[PDB]
Amino acid sequence: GGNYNYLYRLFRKSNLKPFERDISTEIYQAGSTPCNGVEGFNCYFPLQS
Amino acid sequence: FASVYAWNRKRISNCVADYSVLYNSASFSTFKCYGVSPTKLNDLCFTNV
């Protein structure tokens, strides 16, 4: 049925520094339009499973 | 438009392509990019589209 408890991050502003860690969960903003914490086009949740 | 069983095929060629007017037009219900994320299209060059 699928183990959906193992997630990974697929969007970030900038690549990590070595051994750096980032557990935030802010709504990513691809396009120029601001997101205001809601999903939509060019406003994506940053974690996939 | 064209049927689904005889789709069309236009071979875009040498020009200046601006995928931003596409990406941000907000009129599209689905805009998925596979080989390459959408925002980096206006920064690459290919042979044929």
UniProtKB/Swiss-Prot annotation, chain B:
Q: Which organism is it from?
A: Severe acute respiratory syndrome coronavirus 2 (2019-nCoV)
Q: What is the protein named?
A: Spike protein S1
Q: What is the effect of changing S25L?
A: In strain: Omicron/BA.1
Q: Which domain of life is it from?
A: Viruses
The shown residues of the full protein are 347 to 395 of 1273
Report quaternary structure and partners.
Binds to host ACE2. RBD also interacts with the N-linked glycan on 'Asn-90' of ACE2. Cleavage of S generates a polybasic C-terminal sequence on S1 that binds to host Neuropilin-1 (NRP1) and Neuropilin-2 (NRP2) receptors. Interacts with host integrin alpha-5/beta-1 (ITGA5:ITGB1) and with ACE2 in complex with integrin alpha-5/beta-1 (ITGA5:ITGB1). May interact via cytoplasmic c-terminus with M protein. May interact (via N-terminus) with host bilirubin and biliverdin, thereby preventing antibody binding to the SARS-CoV-2 spike NTD via an allosteric mechanism.
Write out the function statement from the record. Attaches the virion to the cell membrane by interacting with host receptor, initiating the infection. The major receptor is host ACE2. When S2/S2' has been cleaved, binding to the receptor triggers direct fusion at the cell membrane. When S2/S2' has not been cleaved, binding to the receptor results in internalization of the virus by endocytosis using host TFRC and GRM2 and leading to fusion of the virion membrane with the host endosomal membrane. Alternatively, may use NRP1/NRP2 and integrin as entry receptors.
